[PDB]
């Protein structure tokens, strides 16, 4: 007869996690996986992971409340808009939200608010534990500064179609045909990473054939000659060689007018180093706070 409506799934310090919130995040991750179910095919492990997610969220929220961080509705305004691709946000966003979960308009904003609170506290503490030495940002940028001899640096990927030491004419023809087909498919908009994974015999095949940033003059002579007139996004044909056919792709390029004789580079090194240290400190803080708190799972 009686129907269970809601219950406490876990107790976290003075707060609680409700089965309703657990179901809400269940639906959230199910929708996320609907796009690609390979992201989260697990069910029980996913449920426990979400349990831990809500536990950490409650810990962080209680800590932030203790400190006194607060957010106004004015900060909420706009902090959602200009994000949905071309959406007419703050009027059309609300109307579309009615069709998915917007039974009550406030729900969405109350969630957004909460999330911002947690972010602001996390960022505050995690960055407070970070320490950066200039010597470190200098060493990280020194490699690129030395490698910036070229006025333009190219991000490149490569694919190899192999040949034996003593190939036959038929083998050469087959390799050339395969390379030309791959080049045509790439120029037709096919994903270069998938093609490299499927066909490339190079060690970077499983990595999508990505070679990364490089100075053109430091590349193999054939690569330097072929790429002398290449630009971002270009697909270049096969290159014959005693060991097979080589295919090259240009992903991105960078450069500046400053005379490198490094020059306005340590800022980017600072960004990357800060990102890495933030990740490490966040992991260490997310587990320093889980150990130190009181948690009891009553999910039973």
């Amino acid at each position: 007869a009686p129907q269970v409506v809601d219950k406490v799934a876990a107790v976290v310090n003075n707060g609680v996690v409700l089965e309703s919130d657990v179901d809400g995040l269940m639906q959230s991750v199910k929708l996320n996986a609907a796009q690609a179910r390979q992201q989260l095919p697990d069910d029980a492990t996913l449920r426990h992971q979400i349990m831990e997610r809500l536990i950490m969220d409650q810990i962080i929220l209680q800590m932030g409340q203790k400190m006194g961080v607060k957010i106004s509705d004015e900060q909420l305004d706009q902090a959602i808009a200009n994000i949905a691709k071309q959406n007419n946000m703050t009027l059309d966003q609300m109307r579309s939200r009615l069709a998915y979960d917007g039974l009550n308009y406030n729900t969405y904003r109350n969630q957004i608010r909460k999330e911002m609170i947690i972010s602001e506290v996390r960022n505050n503490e995690v960055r407070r534990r970070i320490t950066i030495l200039p010597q470190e940002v200098e060493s990280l940028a020194q490699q690129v500064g030395n490698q910036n001899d070229a006025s333009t640096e190219l991000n490149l990927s490569h694919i190899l179609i192999p040949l034996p030491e003593n190939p036959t004419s038929d083998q050469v023809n087959e390799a050339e045909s395969q390379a030309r087909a791959i080049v045509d498919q790439a120029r037709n908009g096919a994903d270069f990473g998938k093609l490299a994974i499927a066909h490339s015999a190079d060690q970077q095949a499983l990595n999508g054939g990505q070679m990364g940033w490089g100075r053109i003059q430091e590349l193999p002579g054939i690569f330097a000659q072929a790429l002398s007139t290449a630009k971002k996004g270009d697909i270049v044909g096969p290159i014959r060689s005693g060991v097979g056919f080589h295919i090259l792709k240009v992903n991105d390029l960078r450069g500046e007018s400053k005379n490198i004789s490094d020059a306005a580079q340590k800022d980017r090194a600072y960004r990357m180093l800060m990102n890495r240290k933030f990740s490490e400190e966040a992991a260490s803080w997310m587990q320093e706070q889980r150990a130190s708190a009181y948690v009891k799972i009553l999910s039973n």
Binding site: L133, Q135, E136, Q287, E288, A291
Partner: protein, 371 residues
Amino acid sequence: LFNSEEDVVKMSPLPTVENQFTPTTAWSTSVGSGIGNFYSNLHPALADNVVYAADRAGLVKALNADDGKEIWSVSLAEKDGWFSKEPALLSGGVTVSGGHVYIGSEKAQVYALNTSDGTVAWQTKVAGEALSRPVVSDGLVLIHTSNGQLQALNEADGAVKWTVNLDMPSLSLRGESAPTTAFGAAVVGGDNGRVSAVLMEQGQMIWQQRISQATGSTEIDRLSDVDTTPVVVNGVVFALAYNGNLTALDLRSGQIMWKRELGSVNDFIVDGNRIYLVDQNDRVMALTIDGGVTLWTQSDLLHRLLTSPVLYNGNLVVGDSEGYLHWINVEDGRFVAQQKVDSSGFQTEPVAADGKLLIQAKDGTVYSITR
């Protein structure tokens, strides 16, 4: 009242083993009163077929390695007896580089004696009691003082070149970390739980990573002293903290490569593709250089207060607080032999070099343990 009724938590019994070989002591010479009941790093040293040893009182002896015959002996106590002929309180492990013998003292003194005769080549005053083994490299002597100062002294002149200040927690473990040299960079542990790399030219920090976990609030659970010597090989730095993690870091970047949940304050050996480590609970282990995967574990000596291991003749030799030396097969971890050497026990590191194995007992008796 209760201090006598109070009982310790654990102590393993003596493992029962059969000796596959007969270990014997080639010779044994008394160097004085020894360190005694004071936790110190003072251990012998070997160089050019000579053995150098000392004790807390101040005695320093150079002995013939082949038979232990004394070559010369001096005392570093007060020359003029300014006050009761105060002991030198030698604590820094005896180091031998070039023609100099470097010894640290708990009176914030560092002595450099002459190999040929034992006269004091020079003496320097440091920022605090030198509890670490002096490390000689690039014409500099590195000293890690008790108050978290890493100082570099000129090998010849003896004057302090540069000083790096390291944080010191409220409560720490006795002893300090001896730095390691690699391509002009000194990697040293810290009592706060961080491994830091500095330059030798002027002492400019490079990077500083945290190795500990410190999953606790009270002081004891926050003890994370990196009192071991980091080992550098093929561009990766292996470090290990108390209650912390056995980590591998990038030499240039200081970035964690892999992590493990073992802790200790004794040194560990890194050879080939394996890491022979002694846990803080006196449990020998063997791991992989690639990762924390364990190959074997010997848990028969828990709470025996073992010393740091030494790889002698392909076998891992470890001392014990009761005065026993245990051999272990690296391949399997099985006890291969056991011997009762001394009665006062062992607390300091054994030494293995040039086919010779040396160990100094708590009473100061240096022992040459041959097969």
